């Protein structure tokens, strides 16, 4: 069980916790702001997933400052976790290519 596979794992779980706390904090921050649409958990969660993967359809978005802060954190956790996985994949490919070379 190599580090790079532990961080990836630890990053997927952590991502899921952020998605969830994100959907939660998002609604809490957005309710109260007139015209706001990020106001029910079920969709707030879909909003999160879309933001973490950075797809950002725009059908949903925070309009308050805290909502936006929650947004920044979700984006970053998403980018960091997905980048941590591709990093784990490069450690795997790089170490194995060494094997196929003898070393």
């Amino acid at each position: 069980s190599a580090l790079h596979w532990r961080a990836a794992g630890a990053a997927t779980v952590l991502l899921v916790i952020v998605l969830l706390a994100g959907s939660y904090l998002a609604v809490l921050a957005e309710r109260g702001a007139p015209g706001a649409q990020l106001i029910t958990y079920p969709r707030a969660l879909w909003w999160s997933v879309a933001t973490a993967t950075t797809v950002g359809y725009g059908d949903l978005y925070p309009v308050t400052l805290w909502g936006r802060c929650v947004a920044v954190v979700v984006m970053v956790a998403g980018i960091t976790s997905f980048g941590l996985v591709t990093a784990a994949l490069a450690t795997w490919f790089v170490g194995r290519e060494q094997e196929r070379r003898g070393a």
Partner: antibody
Amino acid sequence: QVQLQQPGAELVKPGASVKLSCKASGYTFTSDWIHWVKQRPGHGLEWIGEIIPSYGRANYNEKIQKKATLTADKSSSTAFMQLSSLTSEDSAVYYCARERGDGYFAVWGAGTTVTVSS
Amino acid sequence: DILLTQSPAILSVSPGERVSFSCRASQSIGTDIHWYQQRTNGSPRLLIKYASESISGIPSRFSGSGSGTDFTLSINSVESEDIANYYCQQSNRWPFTFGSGTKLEIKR
């Protein structure tokens, strides 16, 4: 079983203030919001405000003159609406409902009739 | 804020007949509309959520339709117990909003 319980009624003199209650029971979650709707005789429903017990934050209907103030009590599972400095205009049936963060009110209280006279 | 227009205010229908109530929103709200029933001296009761999803415990008589800005709450075969005031409410944008209401009336 009756999920939300409210006091059948309350009497109040002008300029005074009352504190209504809504004790909930059943499947409680952290995602739960308790709402307060006001219904003057003959007229329709009117959203007053919301509060999330688990976090304790509350929002109010800014379109109307703000008279209510919401609070909650985790342990006892009771929500409170502090209406202060009332007039004849403020007397009606005040309901409370439970909303599970998905937008609709699945359960309502029997409501509390409030009269404002001397 | 979103404005739900519920007109006509009163509806007069003969028993067993089919009846339809309308709710109109100031702007597109998807299907984030919900119907409540309120009889004389009773509290509101959820009838339909998200415009078409059926609730348990509610006669199969009630059904809703619509999306966007026009929504309809139908009753297949009206009857005495269905006499009341019906309201629509939206969850699309904060704050939640209620319709002015519609009173059902039967002509026997």
